[PDB]
Each structure stands twice: as C-alpha cells, then as structure tokens.
Coordinates of C-alpha atoms and ligand atoms in Angstrom, one line a residue:
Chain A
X1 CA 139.2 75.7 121.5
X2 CA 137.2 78.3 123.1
X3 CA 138.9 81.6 124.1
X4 CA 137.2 85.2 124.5
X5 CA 137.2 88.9 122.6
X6 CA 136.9 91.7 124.5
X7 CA 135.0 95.0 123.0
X8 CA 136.0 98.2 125.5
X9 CA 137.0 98.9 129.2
X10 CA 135.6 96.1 131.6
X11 CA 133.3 98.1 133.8
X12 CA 132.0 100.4 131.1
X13 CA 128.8 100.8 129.0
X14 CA 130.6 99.7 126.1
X15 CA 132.3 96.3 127.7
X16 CA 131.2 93.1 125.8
X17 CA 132.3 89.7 125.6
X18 CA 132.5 87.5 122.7
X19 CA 133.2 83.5 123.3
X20 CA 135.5 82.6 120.0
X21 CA 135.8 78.7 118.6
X22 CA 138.8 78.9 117.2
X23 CA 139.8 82.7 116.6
X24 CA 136.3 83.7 115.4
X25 CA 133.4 84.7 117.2
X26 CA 130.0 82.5 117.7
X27 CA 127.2 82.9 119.6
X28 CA 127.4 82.8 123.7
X29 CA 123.3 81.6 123.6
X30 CA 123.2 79.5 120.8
X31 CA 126.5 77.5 119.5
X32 CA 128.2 76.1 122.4
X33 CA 126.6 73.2 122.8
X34 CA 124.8 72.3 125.9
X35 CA 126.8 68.9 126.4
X36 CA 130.6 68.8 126.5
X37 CA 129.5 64.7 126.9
X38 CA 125.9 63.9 126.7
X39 CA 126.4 60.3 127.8
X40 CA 128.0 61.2 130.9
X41 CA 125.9 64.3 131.7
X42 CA 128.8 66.7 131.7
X43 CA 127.9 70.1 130.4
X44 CA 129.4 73.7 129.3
X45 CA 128.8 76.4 131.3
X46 CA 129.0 80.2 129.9
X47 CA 130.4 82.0 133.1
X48 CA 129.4 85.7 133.5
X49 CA 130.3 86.3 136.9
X50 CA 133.1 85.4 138.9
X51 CA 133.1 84.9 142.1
X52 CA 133.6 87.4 144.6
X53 CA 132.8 90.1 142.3
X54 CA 130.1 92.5 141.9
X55 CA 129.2 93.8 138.1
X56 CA 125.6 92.3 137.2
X57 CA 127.4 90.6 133.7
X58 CA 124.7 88.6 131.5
X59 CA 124.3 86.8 128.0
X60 CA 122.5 89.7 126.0
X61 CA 119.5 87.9 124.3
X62 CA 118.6 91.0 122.1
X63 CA 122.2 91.3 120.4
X64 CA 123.6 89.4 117.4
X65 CA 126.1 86.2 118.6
X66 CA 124.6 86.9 122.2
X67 CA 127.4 88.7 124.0
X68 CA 128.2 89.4 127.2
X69 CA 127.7 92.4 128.6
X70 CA 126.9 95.0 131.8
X71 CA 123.1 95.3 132.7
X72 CA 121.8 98.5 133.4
X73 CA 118.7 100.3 134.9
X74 CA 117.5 103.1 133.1
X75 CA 120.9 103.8 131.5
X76 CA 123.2 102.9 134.8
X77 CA 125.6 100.4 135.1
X78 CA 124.1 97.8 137.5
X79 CA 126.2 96.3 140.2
X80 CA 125.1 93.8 143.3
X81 CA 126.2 95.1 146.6
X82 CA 127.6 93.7 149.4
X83 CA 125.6 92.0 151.5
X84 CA 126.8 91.0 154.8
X85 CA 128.5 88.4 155.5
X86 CA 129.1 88.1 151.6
X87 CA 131.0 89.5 149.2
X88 CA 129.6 90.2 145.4
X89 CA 128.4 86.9 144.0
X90 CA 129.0 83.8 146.1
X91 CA 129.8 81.3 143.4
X92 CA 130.9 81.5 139.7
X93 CA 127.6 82.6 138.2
X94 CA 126.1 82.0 134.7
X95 CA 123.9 79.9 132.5
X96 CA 124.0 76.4 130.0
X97 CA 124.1 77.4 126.5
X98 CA 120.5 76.2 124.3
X99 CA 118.4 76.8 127.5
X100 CA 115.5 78.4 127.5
X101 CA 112.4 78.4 130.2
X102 CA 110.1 79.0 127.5
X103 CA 107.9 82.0 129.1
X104 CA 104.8 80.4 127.3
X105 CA 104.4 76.7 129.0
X106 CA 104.1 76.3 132.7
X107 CA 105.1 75.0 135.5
X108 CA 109.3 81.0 133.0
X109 CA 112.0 83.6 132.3
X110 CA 112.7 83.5 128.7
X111 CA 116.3 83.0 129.9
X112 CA 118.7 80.6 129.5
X113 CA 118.8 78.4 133.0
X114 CA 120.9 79.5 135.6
X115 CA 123.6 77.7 137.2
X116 CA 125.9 78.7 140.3
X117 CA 129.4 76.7 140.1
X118 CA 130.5 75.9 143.5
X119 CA 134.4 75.1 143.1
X120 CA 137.9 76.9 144.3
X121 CA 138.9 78.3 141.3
X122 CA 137.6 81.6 140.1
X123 CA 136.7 81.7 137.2
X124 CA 136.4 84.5 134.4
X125 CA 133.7 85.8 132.2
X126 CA 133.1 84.6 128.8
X127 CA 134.7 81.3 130.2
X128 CA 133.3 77.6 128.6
X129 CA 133.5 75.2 131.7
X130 CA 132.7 71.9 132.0
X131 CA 130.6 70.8 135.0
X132 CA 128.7 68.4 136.7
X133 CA 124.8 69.3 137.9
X134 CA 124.2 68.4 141.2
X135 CA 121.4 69.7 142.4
X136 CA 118.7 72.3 141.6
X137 CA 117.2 75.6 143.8
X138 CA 113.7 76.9 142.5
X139 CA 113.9 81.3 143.4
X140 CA 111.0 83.1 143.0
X141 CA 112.6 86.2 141.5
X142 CA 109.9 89.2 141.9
X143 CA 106.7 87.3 140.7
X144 CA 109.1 84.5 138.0
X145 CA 110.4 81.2 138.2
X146 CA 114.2 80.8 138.7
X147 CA 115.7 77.7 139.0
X148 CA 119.4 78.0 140.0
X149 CA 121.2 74.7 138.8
X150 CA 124.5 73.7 141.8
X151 CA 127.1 72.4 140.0
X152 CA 130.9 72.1 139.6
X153 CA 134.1 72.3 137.1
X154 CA 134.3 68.6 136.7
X155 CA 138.7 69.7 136.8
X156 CA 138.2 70.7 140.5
X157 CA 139.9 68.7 142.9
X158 CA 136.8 67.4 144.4
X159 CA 134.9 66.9 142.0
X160 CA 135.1 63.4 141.9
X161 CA 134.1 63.2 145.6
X162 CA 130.9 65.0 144.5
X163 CA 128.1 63.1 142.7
X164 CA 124.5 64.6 144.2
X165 CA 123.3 67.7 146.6
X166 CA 123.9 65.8 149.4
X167 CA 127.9 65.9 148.9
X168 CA 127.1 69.7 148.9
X169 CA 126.5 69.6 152.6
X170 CA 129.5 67.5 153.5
X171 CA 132.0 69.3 151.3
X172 CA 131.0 72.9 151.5
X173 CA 128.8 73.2 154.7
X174 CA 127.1 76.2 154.9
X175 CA 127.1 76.7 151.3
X176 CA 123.6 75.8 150.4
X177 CA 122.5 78.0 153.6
X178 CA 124.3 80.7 152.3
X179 CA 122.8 80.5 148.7
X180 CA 119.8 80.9 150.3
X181 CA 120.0 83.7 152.6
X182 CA 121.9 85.3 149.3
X183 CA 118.9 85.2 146.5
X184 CA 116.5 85.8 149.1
X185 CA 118.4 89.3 150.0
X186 CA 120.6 90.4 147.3
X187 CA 118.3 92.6 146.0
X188 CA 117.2 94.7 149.0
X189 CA 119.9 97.1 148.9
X190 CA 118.3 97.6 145.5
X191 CA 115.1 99.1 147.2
X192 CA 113.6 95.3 146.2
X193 CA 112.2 93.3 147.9
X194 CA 113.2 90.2 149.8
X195 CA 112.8 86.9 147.3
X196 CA 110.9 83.7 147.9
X197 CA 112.7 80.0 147.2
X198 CA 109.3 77.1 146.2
X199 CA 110.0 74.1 148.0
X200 CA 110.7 75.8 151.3
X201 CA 114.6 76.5 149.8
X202 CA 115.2 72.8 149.2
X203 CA 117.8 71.8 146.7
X204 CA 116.6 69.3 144.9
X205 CA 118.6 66.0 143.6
X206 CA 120.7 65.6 140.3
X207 CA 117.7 63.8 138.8
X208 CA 115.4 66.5 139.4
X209 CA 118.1 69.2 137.8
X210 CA 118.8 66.9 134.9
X211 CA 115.1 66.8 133.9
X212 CA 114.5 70.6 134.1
X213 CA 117.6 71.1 131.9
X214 CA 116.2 69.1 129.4
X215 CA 113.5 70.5 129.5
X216 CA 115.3 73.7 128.5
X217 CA 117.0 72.4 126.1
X218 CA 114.2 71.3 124.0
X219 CA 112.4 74.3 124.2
X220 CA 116.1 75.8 122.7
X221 CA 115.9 73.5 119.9
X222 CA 112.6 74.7 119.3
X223 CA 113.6 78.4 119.2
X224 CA 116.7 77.9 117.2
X225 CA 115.1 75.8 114.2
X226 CA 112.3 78.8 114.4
X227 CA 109.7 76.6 115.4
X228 CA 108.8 78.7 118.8
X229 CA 105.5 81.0 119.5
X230 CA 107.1 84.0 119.9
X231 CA 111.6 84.7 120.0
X232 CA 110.6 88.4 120.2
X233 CA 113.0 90.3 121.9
X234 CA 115.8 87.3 121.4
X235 CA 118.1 87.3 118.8
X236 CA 119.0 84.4 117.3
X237 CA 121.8 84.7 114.9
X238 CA 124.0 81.6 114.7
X239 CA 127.2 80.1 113.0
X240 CA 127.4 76.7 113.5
X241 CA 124.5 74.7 112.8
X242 CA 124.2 75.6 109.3
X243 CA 120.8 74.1 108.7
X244 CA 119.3 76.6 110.7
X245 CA 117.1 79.6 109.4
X246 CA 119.4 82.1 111.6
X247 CA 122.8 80.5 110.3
X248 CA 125.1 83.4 109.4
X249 CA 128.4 82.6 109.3
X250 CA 129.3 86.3 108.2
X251 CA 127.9 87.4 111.9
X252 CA 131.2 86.2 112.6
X253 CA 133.1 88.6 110.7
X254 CA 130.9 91.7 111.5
X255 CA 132.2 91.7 115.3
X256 CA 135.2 94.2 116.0
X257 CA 138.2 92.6 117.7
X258 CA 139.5 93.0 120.9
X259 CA 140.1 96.5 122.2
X260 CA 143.4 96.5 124.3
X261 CA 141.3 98.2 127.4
X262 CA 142.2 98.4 130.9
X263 CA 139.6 97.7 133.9
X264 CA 137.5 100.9 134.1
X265 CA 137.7 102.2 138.0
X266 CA 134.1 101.1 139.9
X267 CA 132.5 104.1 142.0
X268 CA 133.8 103.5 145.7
X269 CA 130.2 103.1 146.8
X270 CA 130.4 99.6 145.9
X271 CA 132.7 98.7 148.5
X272 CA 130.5 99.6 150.8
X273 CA 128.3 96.4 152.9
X274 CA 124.8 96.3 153.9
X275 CA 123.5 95.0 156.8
X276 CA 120.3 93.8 155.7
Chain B
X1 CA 150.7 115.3 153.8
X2 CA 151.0 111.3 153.6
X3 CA 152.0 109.3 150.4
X4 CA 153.0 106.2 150.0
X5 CA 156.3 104.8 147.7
X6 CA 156.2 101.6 146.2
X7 CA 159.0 99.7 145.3
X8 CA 158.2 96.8 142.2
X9 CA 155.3 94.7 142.1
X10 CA 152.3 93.5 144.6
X11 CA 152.4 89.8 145.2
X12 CA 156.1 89.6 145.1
X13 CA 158.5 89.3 147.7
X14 CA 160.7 92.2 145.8
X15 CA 157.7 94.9 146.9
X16 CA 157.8 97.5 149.7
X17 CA 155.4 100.0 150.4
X18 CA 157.7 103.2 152.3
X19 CA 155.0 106.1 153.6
X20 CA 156.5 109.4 152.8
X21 CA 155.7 112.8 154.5
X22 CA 156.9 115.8 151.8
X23 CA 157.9 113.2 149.2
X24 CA 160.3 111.4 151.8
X25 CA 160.1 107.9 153.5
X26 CA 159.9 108.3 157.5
X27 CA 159.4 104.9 159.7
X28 CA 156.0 103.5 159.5
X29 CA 156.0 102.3 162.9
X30 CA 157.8 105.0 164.8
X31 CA 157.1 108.5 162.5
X32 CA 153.6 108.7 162.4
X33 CA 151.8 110.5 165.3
X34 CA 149.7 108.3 167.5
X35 CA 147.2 110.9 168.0
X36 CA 146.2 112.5 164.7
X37 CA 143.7 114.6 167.5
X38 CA 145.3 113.6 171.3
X39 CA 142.5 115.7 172.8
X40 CA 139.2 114.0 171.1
X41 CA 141.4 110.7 170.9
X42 CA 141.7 110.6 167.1
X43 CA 144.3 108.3 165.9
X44 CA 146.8 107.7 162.9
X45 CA 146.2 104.3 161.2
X46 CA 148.9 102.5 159.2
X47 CA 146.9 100.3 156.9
X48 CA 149.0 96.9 155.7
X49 CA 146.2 94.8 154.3
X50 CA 142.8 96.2 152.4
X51 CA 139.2 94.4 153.2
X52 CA 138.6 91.3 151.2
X53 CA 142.6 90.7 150.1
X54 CA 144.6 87.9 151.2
X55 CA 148.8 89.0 150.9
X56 CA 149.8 89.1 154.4
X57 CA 151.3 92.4 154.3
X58 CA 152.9 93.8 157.2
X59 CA 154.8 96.6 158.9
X60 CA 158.6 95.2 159.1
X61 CA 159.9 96.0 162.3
X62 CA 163.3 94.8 161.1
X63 CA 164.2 97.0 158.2
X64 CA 165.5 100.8 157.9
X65 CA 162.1 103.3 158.1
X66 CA 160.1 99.6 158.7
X67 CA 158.3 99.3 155.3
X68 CA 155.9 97.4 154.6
X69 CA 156.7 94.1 153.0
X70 CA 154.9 90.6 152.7
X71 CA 155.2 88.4 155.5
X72 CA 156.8 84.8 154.4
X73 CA 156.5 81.2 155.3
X74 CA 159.8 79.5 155.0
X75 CA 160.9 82.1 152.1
X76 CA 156.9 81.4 150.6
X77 CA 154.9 84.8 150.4
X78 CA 152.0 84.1 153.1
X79 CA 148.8 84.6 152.0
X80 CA 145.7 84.5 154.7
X81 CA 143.5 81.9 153.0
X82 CA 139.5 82.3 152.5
X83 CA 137.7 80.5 155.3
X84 CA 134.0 80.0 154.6
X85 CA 132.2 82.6 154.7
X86 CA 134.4 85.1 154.8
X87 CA 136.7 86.4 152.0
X88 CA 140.5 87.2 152.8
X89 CA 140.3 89.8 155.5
X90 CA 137.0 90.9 156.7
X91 CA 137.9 94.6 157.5
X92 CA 140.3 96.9 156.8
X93 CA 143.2 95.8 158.6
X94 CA 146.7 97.2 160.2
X95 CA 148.2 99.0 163.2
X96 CA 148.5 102.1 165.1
X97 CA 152.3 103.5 164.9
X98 CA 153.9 104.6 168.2
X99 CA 152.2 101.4 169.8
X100 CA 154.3 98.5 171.0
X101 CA 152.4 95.2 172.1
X102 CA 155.2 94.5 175.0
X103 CA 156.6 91.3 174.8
X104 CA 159.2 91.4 177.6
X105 CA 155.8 91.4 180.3
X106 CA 153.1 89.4 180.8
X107 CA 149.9 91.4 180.2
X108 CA 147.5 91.2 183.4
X109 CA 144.0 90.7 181.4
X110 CA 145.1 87.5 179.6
X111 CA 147.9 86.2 181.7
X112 CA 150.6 86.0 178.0
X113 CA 153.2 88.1 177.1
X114 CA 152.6 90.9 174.5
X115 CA 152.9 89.6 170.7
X116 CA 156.0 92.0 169.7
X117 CA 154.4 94.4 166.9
X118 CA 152.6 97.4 167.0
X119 CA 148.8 97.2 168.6
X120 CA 146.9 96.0 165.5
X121 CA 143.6 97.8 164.2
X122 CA 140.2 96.7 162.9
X123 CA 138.7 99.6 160.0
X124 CA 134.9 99.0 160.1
X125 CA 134.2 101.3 157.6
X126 CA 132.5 101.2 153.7
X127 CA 135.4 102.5 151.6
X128 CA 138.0 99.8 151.2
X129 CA 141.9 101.0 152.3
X130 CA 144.8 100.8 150.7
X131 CA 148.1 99.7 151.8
X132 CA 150.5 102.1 153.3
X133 CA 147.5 104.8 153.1
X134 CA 147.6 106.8 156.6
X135 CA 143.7 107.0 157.7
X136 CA 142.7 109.1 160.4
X137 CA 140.3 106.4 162.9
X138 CA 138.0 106.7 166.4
X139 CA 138.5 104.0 168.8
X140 CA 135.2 102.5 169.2
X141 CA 136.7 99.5 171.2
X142 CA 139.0 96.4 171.8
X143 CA 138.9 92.2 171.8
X144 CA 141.9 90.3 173.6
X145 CA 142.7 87.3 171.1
X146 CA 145.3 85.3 172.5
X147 CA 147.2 84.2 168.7
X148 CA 148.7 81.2 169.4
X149 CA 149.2 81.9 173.3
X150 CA 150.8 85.6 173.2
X151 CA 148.4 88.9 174.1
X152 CA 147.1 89.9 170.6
X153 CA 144.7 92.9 171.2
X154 CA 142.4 94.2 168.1
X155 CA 141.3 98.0 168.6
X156 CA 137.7 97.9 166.7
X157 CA 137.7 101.2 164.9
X158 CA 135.9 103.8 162.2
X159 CA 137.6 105.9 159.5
X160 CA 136.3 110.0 160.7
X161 CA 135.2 110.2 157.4
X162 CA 133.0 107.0 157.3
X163 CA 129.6 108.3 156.2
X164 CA 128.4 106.4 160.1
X165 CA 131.1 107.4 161.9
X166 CA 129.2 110.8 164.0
X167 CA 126.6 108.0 164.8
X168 CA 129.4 105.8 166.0
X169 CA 130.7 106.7 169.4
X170 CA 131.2 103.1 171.7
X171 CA 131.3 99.5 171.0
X172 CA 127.2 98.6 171.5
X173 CA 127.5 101.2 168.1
X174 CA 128.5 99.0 166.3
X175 CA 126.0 96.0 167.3
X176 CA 123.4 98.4 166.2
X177 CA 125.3 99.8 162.8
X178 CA 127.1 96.7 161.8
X179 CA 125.1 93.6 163.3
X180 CA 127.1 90.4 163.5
X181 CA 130.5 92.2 162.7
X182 CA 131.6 91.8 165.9
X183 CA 131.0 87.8 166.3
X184 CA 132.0 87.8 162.6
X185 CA 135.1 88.7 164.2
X186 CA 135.4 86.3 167.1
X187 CA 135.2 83.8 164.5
X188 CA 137.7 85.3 161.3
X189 CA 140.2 85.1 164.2
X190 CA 139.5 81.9 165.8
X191 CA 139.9 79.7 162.6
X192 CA 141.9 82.1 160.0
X193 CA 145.1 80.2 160.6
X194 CA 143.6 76.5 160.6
X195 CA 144.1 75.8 156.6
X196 CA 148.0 76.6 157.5
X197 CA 147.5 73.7 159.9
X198 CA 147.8 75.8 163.3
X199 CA 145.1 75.1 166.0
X200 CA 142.1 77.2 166.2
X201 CA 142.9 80.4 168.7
X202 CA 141.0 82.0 171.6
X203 CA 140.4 85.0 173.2
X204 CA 139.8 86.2 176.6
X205 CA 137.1 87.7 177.7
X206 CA 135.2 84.9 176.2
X207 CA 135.6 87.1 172.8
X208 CA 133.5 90.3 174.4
X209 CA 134.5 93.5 173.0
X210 CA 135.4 95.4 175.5
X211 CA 134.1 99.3 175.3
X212 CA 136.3 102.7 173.8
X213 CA 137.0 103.5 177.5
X214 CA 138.8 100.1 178.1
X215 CA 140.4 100.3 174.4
X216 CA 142.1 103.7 175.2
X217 CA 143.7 102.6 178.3
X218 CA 144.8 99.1 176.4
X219 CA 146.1 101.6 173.5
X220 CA 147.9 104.3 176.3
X221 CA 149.6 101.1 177.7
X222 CA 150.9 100.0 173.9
X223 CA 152.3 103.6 173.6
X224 CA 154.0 104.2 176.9
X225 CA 155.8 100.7 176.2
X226 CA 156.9 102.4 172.1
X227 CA 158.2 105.2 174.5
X228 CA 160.6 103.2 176.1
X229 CA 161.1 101.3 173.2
X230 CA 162.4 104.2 171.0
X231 CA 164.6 106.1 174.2
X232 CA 166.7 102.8 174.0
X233 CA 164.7 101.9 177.2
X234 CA 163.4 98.3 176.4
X235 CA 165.1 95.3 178.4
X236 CA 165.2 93.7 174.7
X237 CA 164.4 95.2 171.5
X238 CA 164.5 92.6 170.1
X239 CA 166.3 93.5 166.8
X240 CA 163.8 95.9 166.3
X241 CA 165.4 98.6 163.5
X242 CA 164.3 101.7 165.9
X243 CA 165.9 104.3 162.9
X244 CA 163.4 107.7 162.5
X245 CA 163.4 111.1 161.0
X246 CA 160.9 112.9 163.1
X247 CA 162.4 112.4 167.0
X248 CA 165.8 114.2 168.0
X249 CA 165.3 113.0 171.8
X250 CA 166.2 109.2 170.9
X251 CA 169.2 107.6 170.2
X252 CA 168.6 106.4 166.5
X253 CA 167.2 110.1 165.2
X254 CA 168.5 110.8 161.6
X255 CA 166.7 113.1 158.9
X256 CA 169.4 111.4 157.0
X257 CA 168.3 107.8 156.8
X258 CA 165.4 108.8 154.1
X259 CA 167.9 109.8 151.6
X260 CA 169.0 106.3 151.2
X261 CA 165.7 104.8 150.4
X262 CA 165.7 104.2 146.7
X263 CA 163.1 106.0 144.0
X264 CA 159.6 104.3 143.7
X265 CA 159.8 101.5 140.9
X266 CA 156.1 100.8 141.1
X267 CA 155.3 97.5 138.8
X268 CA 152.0 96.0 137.8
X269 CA 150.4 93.8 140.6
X270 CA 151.8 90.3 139.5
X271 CA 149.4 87.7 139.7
X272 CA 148.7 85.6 142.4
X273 CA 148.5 81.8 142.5
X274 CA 145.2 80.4 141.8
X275 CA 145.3 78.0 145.0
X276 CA 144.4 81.6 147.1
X277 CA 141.2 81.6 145.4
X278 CA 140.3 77.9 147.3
X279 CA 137.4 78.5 150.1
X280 CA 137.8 76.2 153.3
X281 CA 135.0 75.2 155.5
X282 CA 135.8 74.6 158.5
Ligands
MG1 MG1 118.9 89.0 134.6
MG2 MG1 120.7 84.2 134.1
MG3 MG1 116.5 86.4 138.4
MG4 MG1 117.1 82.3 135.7
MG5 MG1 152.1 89.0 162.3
MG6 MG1 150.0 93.5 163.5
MG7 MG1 148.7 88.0 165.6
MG8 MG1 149.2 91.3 166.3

C-alpha cells in the first residue's frame, strides 16, 4: 500500500513529500515501479500537481528517496499563474516512475517523462495512480524536448470508454486544444517566452506514447544499475531492488516523519489572471 | 466597519455567514448602503460566492437579517458544477443590497418578469472575495440573461481597489483589459445549469453588454422597486423576511433583532464530495 509523509507547511520552502510502501519511505524516482500491469500496459503515476492548482510541485532528482517538493527561482517559491481562460494546472500533472529522457541520446530533459491525467477526480500530490496512456504531445520547452504523455486513472468512470487519443476528442472536447494553447503560454506571465509543440501540436497515438515510455524506461534501468554516462546532479538512492549499487534500505529510516503542518497562506498575487 | 459572523462549517447546510457592522449582524440585503459613494456611483457589494468555488451560496431572503446560507436542491446542498473550460464560478460573484429584481412586473427590455432577489453582480477583479466580505465596486456595465425565462440582469463590475480599476471606466474597458471575459460570460451563463439537466439559457440583447450608463439606470430601477419593497409597498412580498436595524421609516425596523442572532461557532470547511471536482463538456 502506498500512502504519503509530509515534511513542513504545504506552500513553504521546507514542504516535501515522501511516497511510503507500507509505513516507510522509498524513493518517488526510483522504487515505484513503472507498471502496475505490464501485460496490460497499465502504469503508476507519481502526481505532483493537482489539478486546478498553482504551486510548481516536482520529483527532486538531486535529494535522497527523490521527494517532492516546491521549485524555486533564485530562492522563491515558484508558482504558475493564471492564465485566462484557465485556472493553475489543467490536468493532474506529474511523471512515470524509472523514466528518464536520457540528455545524452537523441531524438532530452534528464527528467522522468511527463504525463497530464485527464479524469474528474482531483487528485493529490505524492499520489500512486494507475493509468492508461493514450496519447503523446511533444513541447518544445525553451530550446528541450518535452513529451507530455495523455492519460487516465484507469478507476475513472470512463475509462473504459477511452482506449486511444481519438476518444480524447469525443469525451473531453476542447481538452487537447486547451493543452495546447496552455504549454505554449503558461510561461509568459513568467517574462518567458511563448513555447513551441513538434508535430504542429499533434497528439500522437497510444502506440507512439507506449514506445517513447519504453524508451524511458530503459534508459532508467541503465541509470539505476549504474551503468549510465553521466547521473550527475541525480540522486539515486534506493530501497527496493536490493541488487542495486544505490540500495540503502537505511535511507528509509533517515527521513523525519510527518510534521502535523497546516497549508501555508499563498501571496494574493496569485489569484490574479493574465490575459496573455 | 464590515465583518462577517460565521456560524459552523462551509459545505454544510448548518452554515451561515451574518455581516456585522460594530460586532452586530444587520440584514445583508436591506442594511447595507447601496451607494458606498451616491455621487461618483460607488457601490456596496455583498459577495456570496468567491471566483473559482462551486457552493451555491446565497443571500436568503427568507430568514431574520437574510444570512447567507447554501442554496439546496430537494434538501441537497447545490453546488454549480465545472463546465469545460471554466472552473466553478468564473468571477467573483453576488449582489448589490437595497436592489430588488421586481417580480410582480414584467421588465420592458426583455419582455419577463423580474427574477425576485437582489440585482446580482459580476467582480472582475484579481484578488479573489470572500463570502459575506462587503467590497466597495464601479459599475462598468450590464448583460440581460433571461435564467430560465425571468429578467436576470448581471452588473459587470471592478473592486476600487483593483490595481486596473482607474483604467477601467465603461464596458469597451474591459474588452481591452480583460479580452474574452465578457463572451466568457455569455457562455458560463448559457450552459452553467445544463449538468443539473435544465436547458441552456439566453439573453437578450443577443448577450451585448450594455454600457455603465445603461447599467446605472437598470441598477436605479432595482433600488426604487427595494424602496417600495421595505415601506411595506410591494403588491407581494413574497415572504420576503424584510426585518432591519439600520431604517426607523419602515414598518419592520428593530435595533433589537441583532441581539438574537447567536455567537459565531465558526468550524473547519468540511469537505466536499468528490463528484464536484467532475468537468463537463458540453
Ligand atoms: Mg521542471
Ligand atoms: Mg516533469
Ligand atoms: Mg518543461
Ligand atoms: Mg518533461
Ligand atoms: Mg438563485
Ligand atoms: Mg442573485
Ligand atoms: Mg439566476
Ligand atoms: Mg439573479
């Protein structure tokens, strides 16, 4: 069973994350495997984001057991803005566990793969879902490649309805159109500027998606069993595949538990929408 | 100075939100000023529902100082649902006291009788409200929405202290400020009620926004008709309370009434079913 421990006041320098298997803390990057059930391509998300909020959340790659925490910009909390006719993030955002677009082969972020879940519920940070892929955006985000993986909680109520991208445009229309016009602008209140989607802003198919996540994957394996050019910057403590160089099950000990903090107040000025 | 007093928890059907003056609960609807500033047509706002929420909350015409409480659906707390791509309500959202949308006459601009509540009021501005919070607003200007058939106007407005608002001064303002707010609008109300299985509404005027001018006449009318409301005027009051604490001319005045609201017994928010969270497309 996978739960979360939180470390501080959400909306604070000092907020993190933990995902915990059973009561004790493992890492958010590395030990939740990337299938909940390989044979029917059914995978766990990490969600860092939920939707309809604004705090820029992320797996931290340079801490031990990978939690997740608040970006910043020299020293400052970083939050997305509002912008018009949106509000914060658009889906439940985050990434598949053992992913990495290796930043040394080509066509990379040195990231684990992004994916934007698409159903009602809203979901909560540190949360394992299980989804379906079906379909696959490729962002150019300021000079990098960024694929954003569609998919959805394989518990939502139309999930079953929903197989490829197409479904997409007859059970959310709009949705797609909106995830465009959102990565291309949600940076410009930022002083950024305006992003570029390959493939004119296509989605393409489940096929497509499935082969670029394992293509991430392998890479991960790679990284993991130490095998990789360069994991500088990423830290790659573990405590579950014990025949692993990185395997430390006492990382699980060292974290602290779970402050009993409430919600942090955000500065006003993120309310505030940009016409952009 | 304005507070508000909270009785239990948000997203419950136990919760009111009282606005006091000096510590003390006066009427919502018929206590608060119209005109914060008659002569440069500054206006009090009662705010029910914050941007980007969904509880239905609402000025309650029917109970003692008219609190504001959440509307209900056959005993159901009513929650506006998320229609794609909007979120909950799309502005700041509530009504302008000492208003009274008439319905005892038919209103000449849309050929429907008046909705019965006070004139309701679109907050443009950045800082998100707060429920019972008493905003001082310009009128900027007005859209007829005819919600399912009765005269249903929305006054488009700006909070004074709105970092935009000495920049905002007429309705083409806010084309230029805020583009596609205002056919944002035409569309939040069209379809906001189809996922509780009414029928898309329409508005006169083909949805234009007509200009401040035209909005402070619509807003005069809306007060002259409270006027006649509150002197025990109306040809049907319909069970309107009309109880108050600030107005010793009319036939319900008494300071008295605000002694027997209880204390504040402000609870945590409760939660909030997880079926709100669903986004329709339309
Ligand atoms: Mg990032
Ligand atoms: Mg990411
Ligand atoms: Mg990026
Ligand atoms: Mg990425
Ligand atoms: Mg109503
Ligand atoms: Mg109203
Ligand atoms: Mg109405
Ligand atoms: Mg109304």
């Amino acid at each position: 069973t996978y739960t979360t421990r939180q470390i501080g006041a959400k909306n604070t320098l000092e907020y993190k994350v933990y995902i915990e298997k059973d009561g004790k803390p493992v890492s958010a990057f590395h030990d939740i495997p990337l299938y909940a059930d390989k044979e029917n391509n059914i995978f766990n998300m990490v969600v860092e984001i939920p939707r309809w909020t604004n705090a820029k959340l992320e797996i931290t790659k340079e801490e031990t057991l990978n939690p997740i925490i608040q970006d910043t910009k020299k020293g400052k909390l970083r939050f997305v803005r509002n912008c018009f006719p949106h509000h914060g993030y658009i889906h439940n955002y985050g990434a598949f566990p053992q992913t990495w677009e290796d930043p040394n082969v080509s066509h990379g972020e040195n990231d684990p793969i992004d994916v934007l879940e698409i159903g009602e519920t809203i979901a909560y940070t540190g949360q394992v879902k299980q989804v379906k892929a079906l379909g696959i955006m490729a962002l150019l985000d300021e000079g990098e490649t960024d694929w954003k993986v569609i998919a959805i909680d394989i518990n939502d109520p139309l999930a079953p309805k929903l197989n490829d991208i197409e479904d997409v445009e007859k059970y959310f229309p709009g949705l797609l159109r909106a995830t465009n016009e959102w990565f291309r602008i949600y940076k410009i209140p930022d002083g950024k500027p305006e992003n570029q989607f390959a493939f004119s802003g296509e989605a393409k198919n489940k096929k497509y998606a499935l082969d670029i996540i394992k293509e991430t994957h392998d890479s991960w394996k790679q990284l993991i069993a130490g095998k990789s050019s360069d994991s500088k910057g990423i830290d790659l403590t573990n405590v579950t595949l014990p025949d692993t160089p990185t395997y430390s099950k006492a990382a699980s000990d060292a974290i602290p538990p779970a402050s009993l903090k409430a919600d942090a107040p955000i500065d006003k000025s993120i309310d505030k929408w940009f016409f952009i």
